[model samples]
Target: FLDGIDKAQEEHEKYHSNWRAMASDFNLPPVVAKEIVASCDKCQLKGEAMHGQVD
Candidate 1:
């Protein structure tokens, strides 16, 4: 059970890490960065837009 939660966190971390990287490159706001990532299928982040804060 604990491992299951950890695995989920790991997957989520990938998405956020990519989002942060994009934000860093473009100097985008959190909402805009998240939306852009969500729109990008290559990023594998579609439908995974969760709450985001400035990074």
Candidate 2:
């Protein structure tokens, strides 16, 4: 998670929210990713066309 959104999406083939969506590339056990994001924050406003974009 230290890498932040830009680096993550650039490195990964696919980008998504939630832990299971990001487990493998980080060499994590899946569960750990959940623990991390569960404690963090992201966007808090609307966008023209958002994805599952947290806001």
Candidate 3:
């Protein structure tokens, strides 16, 4: 069980890091990217503003 928890944590960190890097490549502001990350962490949105789904 502990090993599974560790693996999940690692995967979460990896995805978060990759997301930040991608946001940078797209010229997104650090603050905005951080907010996006926060929203994603809370399962709020997928970092996209399509379909008129305002955050």
Give the number of the best model, judged by lDDT: 1
Cα displacement (angstroms), candidate 3, residue 18, comes to: 4.5
Tens-digit lDDT track for model 2 on 1-55?
4555435444443443556665665656655565555444432132556476586
Give the clash total for candidate 2: 0
Q: What does candidate 3 score on TM? A: 0.34
**Residue 10, model 1: Cα distance from true site in angstroms:** 26
lDDT of 1 at 55: 80
Of 1 and 3, the candidate ranking higher by TM-score: 1
Models sorted by TM-score, best on top:
1, 2, 3
For 1-55, candidate 1 gives per-residue lDDT tens digits of: 3343344335445664565655554555555456554645666645558767768
Supply the global lDDT for candidate 1: 0.53
Candidate 1, which ten residues in sequence have the lowest lDDT sum? 1-10
**Pairwise lDDT winner, candidates 2 and 3:** 2
Q: Which candidate is the best by TM-score?
A: 1
TM-score between model 1 and native = 0.37
Alpha-carbon error at 38 in model 1, in Å? Answer: 1.4
lDDT order, best first, reads: 1, 2, 3
What is the TM-score of each predicted model, taking all chains together?
Answer: 0.37, 0.35, 0.34
Candidate 3: Cα lDDT at 47: 57
Which candidate do you rate higher for TM-score, 2 or 3? 2
